[PDB]
Amino acid sequence: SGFRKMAFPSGKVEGCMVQVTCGTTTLNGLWLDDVVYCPRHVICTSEDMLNPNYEDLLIRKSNHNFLVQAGNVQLRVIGHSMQNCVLKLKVDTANPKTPKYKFVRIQPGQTFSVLACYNGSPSGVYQCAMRPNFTIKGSFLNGSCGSVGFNIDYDCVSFCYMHHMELPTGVHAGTDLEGNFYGPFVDRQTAQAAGTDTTITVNVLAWLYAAVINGDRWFLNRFTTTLNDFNLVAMKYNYEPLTQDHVDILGPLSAQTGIAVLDMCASLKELLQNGMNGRTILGSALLEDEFTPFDVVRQCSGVTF
Amino acid sequence: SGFRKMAFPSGKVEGCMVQVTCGTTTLNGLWLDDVVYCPRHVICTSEDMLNPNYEDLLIRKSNHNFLVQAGNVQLRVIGHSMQNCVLKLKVDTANPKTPKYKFVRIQPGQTFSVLACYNGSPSGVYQCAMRPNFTIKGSFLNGSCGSVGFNIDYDCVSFCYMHHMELPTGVHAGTDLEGNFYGPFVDRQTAQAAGTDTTITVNVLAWLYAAVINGDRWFLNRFTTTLNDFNLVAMKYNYEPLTQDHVDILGPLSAQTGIAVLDMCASLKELLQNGMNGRTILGSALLEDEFTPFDVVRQCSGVTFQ
Ligand SMILES: *O=C(*)(*)(*)(C1(*)(*)(*)=C(*)(*)N(*)(*)=C(*)(*)C(*)(*)(*)(Br*)=C1(*)*)N1(*)(*)(*)C(*)(*)[C@@](*)(*)N(*)(*)(C(*)(*)(C2(*)(*)=[C@@](*)(*)[C]=[C@](*)(*)C(*)=C2*)C2(*)(*)(*)=C(*)C(*)=C(*)(*)(Cl*)[C@](*)(*)=[C@]2(*)*)[C](*)[C@@]1(*)*
Ligand SMILES: *O=C(*)(*)(*)(C1(*)(*)(*)=C(*)(*)N(*)(*)=C(*)(*)C(*)(*)(*)(Br*)=C1(*)*)N1(*)(*)(*)C(*)(*)[C@](*)(*)N(*)(*)(C(*)(*)(C2(*)(*)=[C@](*)(*)[C@@](*)(*)=C(*)(*)(*)[C@@](*)(*)=[C@]2(*)*)C2(*)(*)(*)=C(*)(*)[C@@](*)(*)=C(Cl*)C(*)=C2*)[C@@](*)(*)[C@@]1(*)*
């Protein structure tokens, strides 16, 4: 037993991370087959970022203006191109450790593992969720751009995020691996800001189910609630309303624990109205909302990769 | 910015995980050079586990009683021996994916990454801290024995934990890779339980520094204190004592915030004596003690402070 914020094994992704240098700027890139992907602002100087013309900036670059290092090995760049907000560098060597992979655009509420990298070298791995306001609450310092986020779907690495910048309020913005931003953000210096965030209700309920599975159930009560009555309480605490799709997604966890979903909702409602009374749930002194129902089943059943 | 519980990348350790089978039992082993390490209770039966004579049980077993599988490859066992509570199986093949490594024994308060494995294959990776009562609070299911904990420094893996069992309160017990149990737990069926735990003071201070760096500053007061006075407070509230070495290790965090270490101690003292008044710190309604000073420096200092 036990339940932890668990990242995917990162080995398959570590073998893909390289260092990309253009001018004075060094960041991270993703080496798959004979292409290296990285944020296109690597070609900008601090002056360009106020109002860049990326096409014009890229026409002035040559292949030899890009220095790509896989560990200590220099990779010869032989072509460069733009796709949306991503730069694609074609190299003369196919990554021999390219895993089975695909590129996926995820939705708010879905989780993934982030491999935080600096200078092409992986430093740490942690779980994140795509927030309702299309940001992520990660941990990133200068030099982290190009760090990627991913899931493992059976035998396939599903890349879903590449880091591009931190917004002034401390949250992080990036693109899918097609180069399109999540949310309304742009890779230039403007007056952009994230909208107000909300708590992912269905994920909190899944984590409460995880607690019951692992023998932590002090928060269960004898009350009932309707869906409509729960949602009015939820919306007052800046939780997102629970839809019938959300209720259905929690079916399997409800069946395994024997706790009806609306009975869990009545327990959550009292946690919101009265606090946790100095108690923890699964070691946490807060209501965790970055486990999906699928994350719970994956961890509690010991799926391997 | 941002502050998250972060594990080390697991790849160097994934390439070392194998499946070990003895009789009807299957668990995980660690394959380094030509040796496989795993918990010695793999040789036991349910009845043995009441009063196991491991020396006699090991003599009974022969090399061919152990099946070791690395992916789809069977490794031939050519010798076996015991070191404390770990079994060492000599195999006829050295692991080609052996990283640079060492075996280390950690102290309470130190953190490490755990790669939870089943049947020789990885499920996921998360961070753990050695509690003062020599347990850890992990995520381990049936079949997880032999999963290892580790730290990585540049290219060197320091293995510090091997998983052996779960205790009655849902916490976890294991050994270092020399087979020496953390704490007084034993690999036999016994009415054992984790003692009362305490809070790791230097880690709480590291975490309060991380909060300040990430803009959560309401708990800071105008007071200072001394190491001696603060340790009287720590003792009353079931906190570990704080040493001068701890003060030195917190230096980089004091420099990035401009808050002296003993000034932070006085702010923690006020939280312990007066409570948090329902406020959160980094989202948490209770003080967190599973981040070391090194863990916070790794996420917050960058090139500016060392
Ligand atoms: O480094 C970095 C970072 C990330 N994350 C977090 C942090 Br604290 C930091 N980065 C890099 C830089 N960027 C910028 C630039 C770019 C290029 C050039 C110059 C500058 C930006 C980006 C994007 C936008 Cl939209 C703006 C700005 C930042 C991030
Ligand atoms: O699997 C397992 C586990 C781990 N962790 C968590 C869980 Br839920 C589960 N395991 C295996 C088994 N074991 C036992 C013991 C140990 C130590 C002490 C006592 C008991 C056994 C072993 C061997 C035999 Cl033959 C039987 C039993 C636990 C852990």
PDB file of all heavy atoms in Angstrom, chain A residues 1 4 7 10-11 14 123-125 127 137 139-140 166 285 299 303 305, chain B residues 1 4 7 10-11 14 122-125 127 137 139-140 166 285 298-299:
ATOM      1  N   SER A   1       0.825  -1.204   0.000  1.00  0.00           N
ATOM      2  CA  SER A   1       0.000   0.000   0.000  1.00  0.00           C
ATOM      3  C   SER A   1       0.866   1.263   0.000  1.00  0.00           C
ATOM      4  O   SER A   1       2.080   1.189  -0.054  1.00  0.00           O
ATOM      5  CB  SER A   1      -0.942   0.019   1.208  1.00  0.00           C
ATOM      6  OG  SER A   1      -0.232   0.278   2.421  1.00  0.00           O
ATOM      7  N   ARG A   4       1.661   7.720  -3.896  1.00  0.00           N
ATOM      8  CA  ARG A   4       2.610   8.817  -4.041  1.00  0.00           C
ATOM      9  C   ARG A   4       2.419   9.509  -5.386  1.00  0.00           C
ATOM     10  O   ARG A   4       1.889   8.932  -6.334  1.00  0.00           O
ATOM     11  CB  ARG A   4       4.058   8.314  -3.917  1.00  0.00           C
ATOM     12  CG  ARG A   4       4.318   7.531  -2.639  1.00  0.00           C
ATOM     13  CD  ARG A   4       4.339   8.481  -1.473  1.00  0.00           C
ATOM     14  NE  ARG A   4       4.926   9.740  -1.905  1.00  0.00           N
ATOM     15  CZ  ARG A   4       6.218  10.016  -1.812  1.00  0.00           C
ATOM     16  NH1 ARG A   4       7.058   9.186  -1.210  1.00  0.00           N
ATOM     17  NH2 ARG A   4       6.682  11.142  -2.352  1.00  0.00           N
ATOM     18  N   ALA A   7       5.980   9.726 -11.059  1.00  0.00           N
ATOM     19  CA  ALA A   7       6.304   9.985 -12.454  1.00  0.00           C
ATOM     20  C   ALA A   7       6.555   8.687 -13.214  1.00  0.00           C
ATOM     21  O   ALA A   7       6.942   7.671 -12.639  1.00  0.00           O
ATOM     22  CB  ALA A   7       7.540  10.883 -12.539  1.00  0.00           C
ATOM     23  N   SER A  10      11.676   7.432 -16.728  1.00  0.00           N
ATOM     24  CA  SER A  10      12.067   8.433 -17.711  1.00  0.00           C
ATOM     25  C   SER A  10      13.140   7.946 -18.667  1.00  0.00           C
ATOM     26  O   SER A  10      13.574   8.716 -19.530  1.00  0.00           O
ATOM     27  CB  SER A  10      12.547   9.714 -17.013  1.00  0.00           C
ATOM     28  OG  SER A  10      13.645   9.485 -16.134  1.00  0.00           O
ATOM     29  N   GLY A  11      13.585   6.698 -18.530  1.00  0.00           N
ATOM     30  CA  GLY A  11      14.754   6.257 -19.269  1.00  0.00           C
ATOM     31  C   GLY A  11      14.627   6.486 -20.760  1.00  0.00           C
ATOM     32  O   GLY A  11      15.534   7.022 -21.402  1.00  0.00           O
ATOM     33  N   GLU A  14      15.212  10.198 -21.462  1.00  0.00           N
ATOM     34  CA  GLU A  14      16.558  10.707 -21.186  1.00  0.00           C
ATOM     35  C   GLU A  14      17.477  10.552 -22.392  1.00  0.00           C
ATOM     36  O   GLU A  14      18.265  11.452 -22.705  1.00  0.00           O
ATOM     37  CB  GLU A  14      17.167   9.974 -19.988  1.00  0.00           C
ATOM     38  CG  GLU A  14      16.482  10.256 -18.668  1.00  0.00           C
ATOM     39  CD  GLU A  14      16.902   9.272 -17.581  1.00  0.00           C
ATOM     40  OE1 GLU A  14      18.114   8.962 -17.463  1.00  0.00           O
ATOM     41  OE2 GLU A  14      15.998   8.766 -16.889  1.00  0.00           O
ATOM     42  N   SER A 123      17.725  16.575 -15.226  1.00  0.00           N
ATOM     43  CA  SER A 123      17.986  16.847 -13.822  1.00  0.00           C
ATOM     44  C   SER A 123      16.954  16.263 -12.872  1.00  0.00           C
ATOM     45  O   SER A 123      17.305  15.924 -11.740  1.00  0.00           O
ATOM     46  CB  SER A 123      18.087  18.363 -13.590  1.00  0.00           C
ATOM     47  OG  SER A 123      17.702  18.714 -12.271  1.00  0.00           O
ATOM     48  N   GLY A 124      15.701  16.143 -13.285  1.00  0.00           N
ATOM     49  CA  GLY A 124      14.684  15.642 -12.371  1.00  0.00           C
ATOM     50  C   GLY A 124      13.400  15.354 -13.109  1.00  0.00           C
ATOM     51  O   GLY A 124      13.217  15.761 -14.262  1.00  0.00           O
ATOM     52  N   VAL A 125      12.504  14.631 -12.435  1.00  0.00           N
ATOM     53  CA  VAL A 125      11.249  14.223 -13.062  1.00  0.00           C
ATOM     54  C   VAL A 125      10.125  14.334 -12.035  1.00  0.00           C
ATOM     55  O   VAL A 125      10.300  13.994 -10.861  1.00  0.00           O
ATOM     56  CB  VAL A 125      11.358  12.797 -13.663  1.00  0.00           C
ATOM     57  CG1 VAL A 125      11.622  11.756 -12.605  1.00  0.00           C
ATOM     58  CG2 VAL A 125      10.128  12.469 -14.521  1.00  0.00           C
ATOM     59  N   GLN A 127       5.449  14.913 -11.709  1.00  0.00           N
ATOM     60  CA  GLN A 127       4.139  14.908 -12.346  1.00  0.00           C
ATOM     61  C   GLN A 127       3.570  16.317 -12.380  1.00  0.00           C
ATOM     62  O   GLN A 127       3.747  17.090 -11.440  1.00  0.00           O
ATOM     63  CB  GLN A 127       3.169  14.013 -11.583  1.00  0.00           C
ATOM     64  CG  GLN A 127       3.335  12.574 -11.879  1.00  0.00           C
ATOM     65  CD  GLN A 127       2.932  12.190 -13.275  1.00  0.00           C
ATOM     66  OE1 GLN A 127       3.792  12.066 -14.141  1.00  0.00           O
ATOM     67  NE2 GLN A 127       1.649  11.930 -13.492  1.00  0.00           N
ATOM     68  N   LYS A 137       1.765  24.139 -13.316  1.00  0.00           N
ATOM     69  CA  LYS A 137       2.464  24.579 -12.108  1.00  0.00           C
ATOM     70  C   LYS A 137       3.660  23.651 -11.928  1.00  0.00           C
ATOM     71  O   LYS A 137       3.578  22.624 -11.252  1.00  0.00           O
ATOM     72  CB  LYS A 137       1.521  24.552 -10.910  1.00  0.00           C
ATOM     73  CG  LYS A 137       0.214  25.279 -11.179  1.00  0.00           C
ATOM     74  CD  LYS A 137      -0.773  25.114 -10.027  1.00  0.00           C
ATOM     75  CE  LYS A 137      -1.130  26.432  -9.389  1.00  0.00           C
ATOM     76  NZ  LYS A 137      -1.382  26.255  -7.930  1.00  0.00           N
ATOM     77  N   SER A 139       8.285  23.319 -11.983  1.00  0.00           N
ATOM     78  CA  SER A 139       9.488  23.800 -11.311  1.00  0.00           C
ATOM     79  C   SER A 139      10.537  23.977 -12.396  1.00  0.00           C
ATOM     80  O   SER A 139      11.065  22.988 -12.917  1.00  0.00           O
ATOM     81  CB  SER A 139       9.961  22.818 -10.235  1.00  0.00           C
ATOM     82  OG  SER A 139      11.059  23.346  -9.505  1.00  0.00           O
ATOM     83  N   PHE A 140      10.834  25.228 -12.742  1.00  0.00           N
ATOM     84  CA  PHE A 140      11.689  25.532 -13.877  1.00  0.00           C
ATOM     85  C   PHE A 140      12.524  26.759 -13.562  1.00  0.00           C
ATOM     86  O   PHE A 140      11.998  27.766 -13.079  1.00  0.00           O
ATOM     87  CB  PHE A 140      10.884  25.823 -15.162  1.00  0.00           C
ATOM     88  CG  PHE A 140      10.138  24.636 -15.728  1.00  0.00           C
ATOM     89  CD1 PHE A 140       8.759  24.555 -15.618  1.00  0.00           C
ATOM     90  CD2 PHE A 140      10.810  23.637 -16.429  1.00  0.00           C
ATOM     91  CE1 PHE A 140       8.059  23.487 -16.160  1.00  0.00           C
ATOM     92  CE2 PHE A 140      10.113  22.562 -16.985  1.00  0.00           C
ATOM     93  CZ  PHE A 140       8.740  22.494 -16.852  1.00  0.00           C
ATOM     94  N   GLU A 166       8.127  31.065 -18.459  1.00  0.00           N
ATOM     95  CA  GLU A 166       7.351  31.298 -17.251  1.00  0.00           C
ATOM     96  C   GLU A 166       6.636  32.645 -17.354  1.00  0.00           C
ATOM     97  O   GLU A 166       7.229  33.643 -17.787  1.00  0.00           O
ATOM     98  CB  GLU A 166       8.242  31.228 -16.004  1.00  0.00           C
ATOM     99  CG  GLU A 166       7.593  31.782 -14.762  1.00  0.00           C
ATOM    100  CD  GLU A 166       8.238  31.309 -13.451  1.00  0.00           C
ATOM    101  OE1 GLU A 166       8.998  30.307 -13.441  1.00  0.00           O
ATOM    102  OE2 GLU A 166       8.049  32.023 -12.440  1.00  0.00           O
ATOM    103  N   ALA A 285      -1.327  17.609   3.381  1.00  0.00           N
ATOM    104  CA  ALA A 285      -2.095  18.584   4.149  1.00  0.00           C
ATOM    105  C   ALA A 285      -2.844  19.552   3.239  1.00  0.00           C
ATOM    106  O   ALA A 285      -2.888  20.754   3.501  1.00  0.00           O
ATOM    107  CB  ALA A 285      -1.180  19.339   5.113  1.00  0.00           C
ATOM    108  N   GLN A 299      -1.372   3.378 -10.783  1.00  0.00           N
ATOM    109  CA  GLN A 299      -0.485   3.202  -9.640  1.00  0.00           C
ATOM    110  C   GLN A 299      -0.951   2.073  -8.727  1.00  0.00           C
ATOM    111  O   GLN A 299      -0.133   1.262  -8.256  1.00  0.00           O
ATOM    112  CB  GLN A 299      -0.374   4.503  -8.841  1.00  0.00           C
ATOM    113  CG  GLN A 299       0.643   4.345  -7.724  1.00  0.00           C
ATOM    114  CD  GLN A 299       0.946   5.610  -6.987  1.00  0.00           C
ATOM    115  OE1 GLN A 299       1.497   5.570  -5.886  1.00  0.00           O
ATOM    116  NE2 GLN A 299       0.572   6.751  -7.573  1.00  0.00           N
ATOM    117  N   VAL A 303       1.060  -1.242 -12.805  1.00  0.00           N
ATOM    118  CA  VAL A 303       1.385  -1.277 -14.227  1.00  0.00           C
ATOM    119  C   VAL A 303       2.860  -0.960 -14.413  1.00  0.00           C
ATOM    120  O   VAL A 303       3.386  -0.018 -13.808  1.00  0.00           O
ATOM    121  CB  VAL A 303       0.504  -0.269 -14.984  1.00  0.00           C
ATOM    122  CG1 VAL A 303       0.868  -0.241 -16.477  1.00  0.00           C
ATOM    123  CG2 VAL A 303      -0.985  -0.563 -14.751  1.00  0.00           C
ATOM    124  N   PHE A 305       6.368  -0.700 -17.304  1.00  0.00           N
ATOM    125  CA  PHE A 305       6.684  -0.243 -18.666  1.00  0.00           C
ATOM    126  C   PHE A 305       8.038  -0.725 -19.194  1.00  0.00           C
ATOM    127  O   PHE A 305       8.974  -0.972 -18.438  1.00  0.00           O
ATOM    128  CB  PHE A 305       6.609   1.285 -18.719  1.00  0.00           C
ATOM    129  CG  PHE A 305       5.314   1.836 -18.201  1.00  0.00           C
ATOM    130  CD1 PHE A 305       5.177   2.237 -16.876  1.00  0.00           C
ATOM    131  CD2 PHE A 305       4.215   1.925 -19.045  1.00  0.00           C
ATOM    132  CE1 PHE A 305       3.956   2.727 -16.410  1.00  0.00           C
ATOM    133  CE2 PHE A 305       3.004   2.412 -18.591  1.00  0.00           C
ATOM    134  CZ  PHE A 305       2.874   2.813 -17.271  1.00  0.00           C
TER     135      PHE A 305
ATOM    136  N   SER B   1      10.886  29.607 -11.469  1.00  0.00           N
ATOM    137  CA  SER B   1      10.399  29.374 -10.116  1.00  0.00           C
ATOM    138  C   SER B   1       9.457  28.178 -10.083  1.00  0.00           C
ATOM    139  O   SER B   1       9.323  27.449 -11.069  1.00  0.00           O
ATOM    140  CB  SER B   1       9.687  30.618  -9.571  1.00  0.00           C
ATOM    141  OG  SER B   1       8.405  30.755 -10.146  1.00  0.00           O
ATOM    142  N   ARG B   4       8.475  21.713  -6.467  1.00  0.00           N
ATOM    143  CA  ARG B   4       7.793  20.444  -6.637  1.00  0.00           C
ATOM    144  C   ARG B   4       8.666  19.335  -6.055  1.00  0.00           C
ATOM    145  O   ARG B   4       9.889  19.416  -6.099  1.00  0.00           O
ATOM    146  CB  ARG B   4       7.532  20.174  -8.125  1.00  0.00           C
ATOM    147  CG  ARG B   4       6.637  21.210  -8.803  1.00  0.00           C
ATOM    148  CD  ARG B   4       5.244  21.199  -8.186  1.00  0.00           C
ATOM    149  NE  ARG B   4       4.789  19.819  -8.092  1.00  0.00           N
ATOM    150  CZ  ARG B   4       4.300  19.135  -9.116  1.00  0.00           C
ATOM    151  NH1 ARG B   4       4.073  19.715 -10.283  1.00  0.00           N
ATOM    152  NH2 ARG B   4       4.062  17.832  -8.971  1.00  0.00           N
ATOM    153  N   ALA B   7      12.049  13.778  -8.426  1.00  0.00           N
ATOM    154  CA  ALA B   7      12.900  12.599  -8.336  1.00  0.00           C
ATOM    155  C   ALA B   7      14.034  12.727  -9.341  1.00  0.00           C
ATOM    156  O   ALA B   7      13.973  13.530 -10.268  1.00  0.00           O
ATOM    157  CB  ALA B   7      12.095  11.321  -8.598  1.00  0.00           C
ATOM    158  N   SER B  10      15.397   8.168 -13.844  1.00  0.00           N
ATOM    159  CA  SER B  10      15.530   6.776 -13.426  1.00  0.00           C
ATOM    160  C   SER B  10      16.279   5.887 -14.414  1.00  0.00           C
ATOM    161  O   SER B  10      16.493   4.705 -14.111  1.00  0.00           O
ATOM    162  CB  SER B  10      14.137   6.179 -13.164  1.00  0.00           C
ATOM    163  OG  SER B  10      13.323   6.279 -14.328  1.00  0.00           O
ATOM    164  N   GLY B  11      16.696   6.414 -15.571  1.00  0.00           N
ATOM    165  CA  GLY B  11      17.192   5.545 -16.633  1.00  0.00           C
ATOM    166  C   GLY B  11      18.380   4.689 -16.235  1.00  0.00           C
ATOM    167  O   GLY B  11      18.449   3.505 -16.582  1.00  0.00           O
ATOM    168  N   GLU B  14      16.978   1.846 -14.281  1.00  0.00           N
ATOM    169  CA  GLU B  14      16.170   0.920 -15.074  1.00  0.00           C
ATOM    170  C   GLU B  14      17.014  -0.168 -15.730  1.00  0.00           C
ATOM    171  O   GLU B  14      16.595  -1.335 -15.803  1.00  0.00           O
ATOM    172  CB  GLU B  14      15.405   1.680 -16.156  1.00  0.00           C
ATOM    173  CG  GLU B  14      14.317   2.597 -15.607  1.00  0.00           C
ATOM    174  CD  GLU B  14      13.739   3.504 -16.682  1.00  0.00           C
ATOM    175  OE1 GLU B  14      13.401   3.003 -17.773  1.00  0.00           O
ATOM    176  OE2 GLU B  14      13.597   4.706 -16.419  1.00  0.00           O
ATOM    177  N   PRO B 122       9.931  -1.484 -14.430  1.00  0.00           N
ATOM    178  CA  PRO B 122       9.635  -0.288 -13.629  1.00  0.00           C
ATOM    179  C   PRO B 122       8.194   0.179 -13.769  1.00  0.00           C
ATOM    180  O   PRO B 122       7.651   0.233 -14.871  1.00  0.00           O
ATOM    181  CB  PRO B 122      10.574   0.772 -14.223  1.00  0.00           C
ATOM    182  CG  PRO B 122      11.404   0.076 -15.265  1.00  0.00           C
ATOM    183  CD  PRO B 122      10.653  -1.146 -15.665  1.00  0.00           C
ATOM    184  N   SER B 123       7.599   0.578 -12.637  1.00  0.00           N
ATOM    185  CA  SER B 123       6.275   1.188 -12.624  1.00  0.00           C
ATOM    186  C   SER B 123       6.322   2.712 -12.561  1.00  0.00           C
ATOM    187  O   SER B 123       5.557   3.386 -13.258  1.00  0.00           O
ATOM    188  CB  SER B 123       5.475   0.643 -11.428  1.00  0.00           C
ATOM    189  OG  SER B 123       4.169   1.188 -11.406  1.00  0.00           O
ATOM    190  N   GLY B 124       7.208   3.267 -11.749  1.00  0.00           N
ATOM    191  CA  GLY B 124       7.273   4.712 -11.637  1.00  0.00           C
ATOM    192  C   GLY B 124       8.347   5.105 -10.647  1.00  0.00           C
ATOM    193  O   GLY B 124       8.990   4.258 -10.014  1.00  0.00           O
ATOM    194  N   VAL B 125       8.529   6.417 -10.514  1.00  0.00           N
ATOM    195  CA  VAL B 125       9.615   6.946  -9.694  1.00  0.00           C
ATOM    196  C   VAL B 125       9.085   8.093  -8.852  1.00  0.00           C
ATOM    197  O   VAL B 125       8.320   8.941  -9.330  1.00  0.00           O
ATOM    198  CB  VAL B 125      10.818   7.362 -10.572  1.00  0.00           C
ATOM    199  CG1 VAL B 125      10.414   8.403 -11.592  1.00  0.00           C
ATOM    200  CG2 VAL B 125      12.008   7.806  -9.721  1.00  0.00           C
ATOM    201  N   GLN B 127       9.958  10.461  -4.853  1.00  0.00           N
ATOM    202  CA  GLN B 127      10.907  10.857  -3.817  1.00  0.00           C
ATOM    203  C   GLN B 127      10.466  10.382  -2.443  1.00  0.00           C
ATOM    204  O   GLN B 127       9.280  10.438  -2.105  1.00  0.00           O
ATOM    205  CB  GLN B 127      11.041  12.374  -3.746  1.00  0.00           C
ATOM    206  CG  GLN B 127      11.980  12.982  -4.701  1.00  0.00           C
ATOM    207  CD  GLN B 127      13.432  12.736  -4.383  1.00  0.00           C
ATOM    208  OE1 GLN B 127      14.071  11.885  -5.003  1.00  0.00           O
ATOM    209  NE2 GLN B 127      13.974  13.492  -3.425  1.00  0.00           N
ATOM    210  N   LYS B 137       7.877   6.308   3.691  1.00  0.00           N
ATOM    211  CA  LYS B 137       6.468   6.319   3.308  1.00  0.00           C
ATOM    212  C   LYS B 137       6.427   6.284   1.785  1.00  0.00           C
ATOM    213  O   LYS B 137       6.420   7.325   1.129  1.00  0.00           O
ATOM    214  CB  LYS B 137       5.746   7.549   3.865  1.00  0.00           C
ATOM    215  CG  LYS B 137       5.650   7.579   5.389  1.00  0.00           C
ATOM    216  CD  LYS B 137       4.774   8.736   5.860  1.00  0.00           C
ATOM    217  CE  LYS B 137       5.579  10.013   6.018  1.00  0.00           C
ATOM    218  NZ  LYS B 137       5.044  10.911   7.096  1.00  0.00           N
ATOM    219  N   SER B 139       5.251   3.789  -1.947  1.00  0.00           N
ATOM    220  CA  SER B 139       4.134   3.196  -2.682  1.00  0.00           C
ATOM    221  C   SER B 139       4.656   1.853  -3.169  1.00  0.00           C
ATOM    222  O   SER B 139       5.383   1.804  -4.168  1.00  0.00           O
ATOM    223  CB  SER B 139       3.696   4.063  -3.856  1.00  0.00           C
ATOM    224  OG  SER B 139       2.686   3.408  -4.604  1.00  0.00           O
ATOM    225  N   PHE B 140       4.291   0.787  -2.465  1.00  0.00           N
ATOM    226  CA  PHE B 140       4.849  -0.544  -2.708  1.00  0.00           C
ATOM    227  C   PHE B 140       3.726  -1.564  -2.599  1.00  0.00           C
ATOM    228  O   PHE B 140       3.074  -1.651  -1.554  1.00  0.00           O
ATOM    229  CB  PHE B 140       5.932  -0.887  -1.681  1.00  0.00           C
ATOM    230  CG  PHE B 140       7.187  -0.048  -1.767  1.00  0.00           C
ATOM    231  CD1 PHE B 140       7.515   0.826  -0.747  1.00  0.00           C
ATOM    232  CD2 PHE B 140       8.077  -0.199  -2.822  1.00  0.00           C
ATOM    233  CE1 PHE B 140       8.685   1.588  -0.797  1.00  0.00           C
ATOM    234  CE2 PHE B 140       9.255   0.556  -2.876  1.00  0.00           C
ATOM    235  CZ  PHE B 140       9.558   1.427  -1.852  1.00  0.00           C
ATOM    236  N   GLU B 166       6.490  -4.207   4.345  1.00  0.00           N
ATOM    237  CA  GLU B 166       5.601  -3.153   4.818  1.00  0.00           C
ATOM    238  C   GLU B 166       5.232  -3.404   6.274  1.00  0.00           C
ATOM    239  O   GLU B 166       4.942  -4.535   6.658  1.00  0.00           O
ATOM    240  CB  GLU B 166       4.337  -3.062   3.941  1.00  0.00           C
ATOM    241  CG  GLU B 166       3.342  -1.958   4.387  1.00  0.00           C
ATOM    242  CD  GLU B 166       2.270  -1.672   3.341  1.00  0.00           C
ATOM    243  OE1 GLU B 166       2.630  -1.422   2.165  1.00  0.00           O
ATOM    244  OE2 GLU B 166       1.067  -1.702   3.686  1.00  0.00           O
ATOM    245  N   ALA B 285      -1.304  23.051   4.620  1.00  0.00           N
ATOM    246  CA  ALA B 285      -1.805  23.511   5.912  1.00  0.00           C
ATOM    247  C   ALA B 285      -0.958  23.044   7.089  1.00  0.00           C
ATOM    248  O   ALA B 285      -1.212  23.485   8.219  1.00  0.00           O
ATOM    249  CB  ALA B 285      -3.252  23.051   6.121  1.00  0.00           C
ATOM    250  N   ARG B 298      18.724  22.813  -5.185  1.00  0.00           N
ATOM    251  CA  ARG B 298      18.724  22.284  -6.543  1.00  0.00           C
ATOM    252  C   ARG B 298      17.638  22.940  -7.394  1.00  0.00           C
ATOM    253  O   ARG B 298      17.837  23.172  -8.593  1.00  0.00           O
ATOM    254  CB  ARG B 298      18.534  20.762  -6.475  1.00  0.00           C
ATOM    255  CG  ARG B 298      19.283  19.986  -7.518  1.00  0.00           C
ATOM    256  CD  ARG B 298      19.092  18.488  -7.311  1.00  0.00           C
ATOM    257  NE  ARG B 298      18.865  17.788  -8.566  1.00  0.00           N
ATOM    258  CZ  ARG B 298      19.808  17.604  -9.482  1.00  0.00           C
ATOM    259  NH1 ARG B 298      21.038  18.064  -9.307  1.00  0.00           N
ATOM    260  NH2 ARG B 298      19.514  16.933 -10.594  1.00  0.00           N
ATOM    261  N   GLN B 299      16.497  23.281  -6.789  1.00  0.00           N
ATOM    262  CA  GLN B 299      15.370  23.870  -7.495  1.00  0.00           C
ATOM    263  C   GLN B 299      15.322  25.386  -7.453  1.00  0.00           C
ATOM    264  O   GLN B 299      14.547  25.976  -8.210  1.00  0.00           O
ATOM    265  CB  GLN B 299      14.052  23.339  -6.927  1.00  0.00           C
ATOM    266  CG  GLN B 299      13.742  21.925  -7.317  1.00  0.00           C
ATOM    267  CD  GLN B 299      12.349  21.534  -6.883  1.00  0.00           C
ATOM    268  OE1 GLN B 299      11.366  22.131  -7.313  1.00  0.00           O
ATOM    269  NE2 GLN B 299      12.258  20.557  -5.994  1.00  0.00           N
TER     270      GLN B 299
END
